[PDB]
Symmetry: none
Subunit: 125 residues, 3 copies
């Protein structure tokens, strides 16, 4: 029922409860912090293209903000590739494990197609 679309540029729109995008602009309100709590509502959200651009900068700088963004990535599934480049960057790092999930459909499909023809051949003979 609720759809929220935010494109970037200049100017300032502040509506209380949740997200905060960057880029220079003088603003002040009241009460700070909340990076993890605000980091949770961005994963189990959506953001296909828009999402990604965020993590690069989180995985580009900081040491904890990379880790979190990593755990941030894993609980959304479909988003590797990029993760790897950023690891072959400056130093060593820790990968995950998005492979096994795929080993299923692999050897899975085959067997299906197999008995799929063995039958379509015993009905004509």
């Amino acid at each position: 029922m609720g759809s929220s679309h935010h494109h970037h540029h200049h100017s300032s729109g502040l509506v209380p409860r949740g997200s905060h995008m960057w880029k220079q602009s003088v603003e002040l309100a009241k009460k700070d912090s909340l990076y993890k709590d605000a980091m949770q509502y961005a994963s189990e959200s959506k953001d296909t293209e828009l999402a990604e651009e965020l993590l690069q900068w989180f995985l580009q700088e900081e040491k904890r903000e990379c880790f979190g963004a990593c755990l941030f990535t894993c609980y959304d599934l479909l988003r590797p590739d990029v993760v790897l480049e950023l690891a072959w960057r400056h130093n060593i790092m820790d990968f995950a494990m998005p492979y096994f999930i795929q080993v299923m459909k692999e050897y899975l499909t085959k067997v299906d197609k197999l008995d799929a023809s063995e039958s379509l051949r015993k009905e004509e003979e």
Copy 2:
């Protein structure tokens, strides 16, 4: 043989034709030595659509290397066989009644 410019022009007139093991094997020797000569050949291997191994070996030389990965095109396949197994069971079962 003679000279060398002739070499660098060969491997290059063989990339257009391109074959199987003929176009494959040709590469390892284009990698046995020289610099960019190995590079230009590294392109050919992948052109064969499917050829690792020689991508791992020459990777353990000295400096950094490259890489690429397929996938996905496969992802949009099992989703098709799962739609056929259903429509071949719904009507096949709604008939035994």
Copy 3:
């Protein structure tokens, strides 16, 4: 004066089976002794979790004892995952890719399944 009686009986029970491989030299110039022997023969058992539990402590504080454990599941079929977490235990790892072989028939039954229909359709209408 003298009598000799040699009675030789040989009954071979088709049961005893010993598999002996090889791999001692290579180019590394670093060998650590102890263990080994009874671990390469037990490798012919595997299966179930208890089988993988055998790669746990055999792939820990061991070197020339991990490869013998590597030349174990490759002889098998499919069983990765941990095969990687250990190479990230603290050091490096060598060889692998026991699935780059099946990477063929797939895309083939792939570019083939498309044409198997693209014709019967150009054939239809």
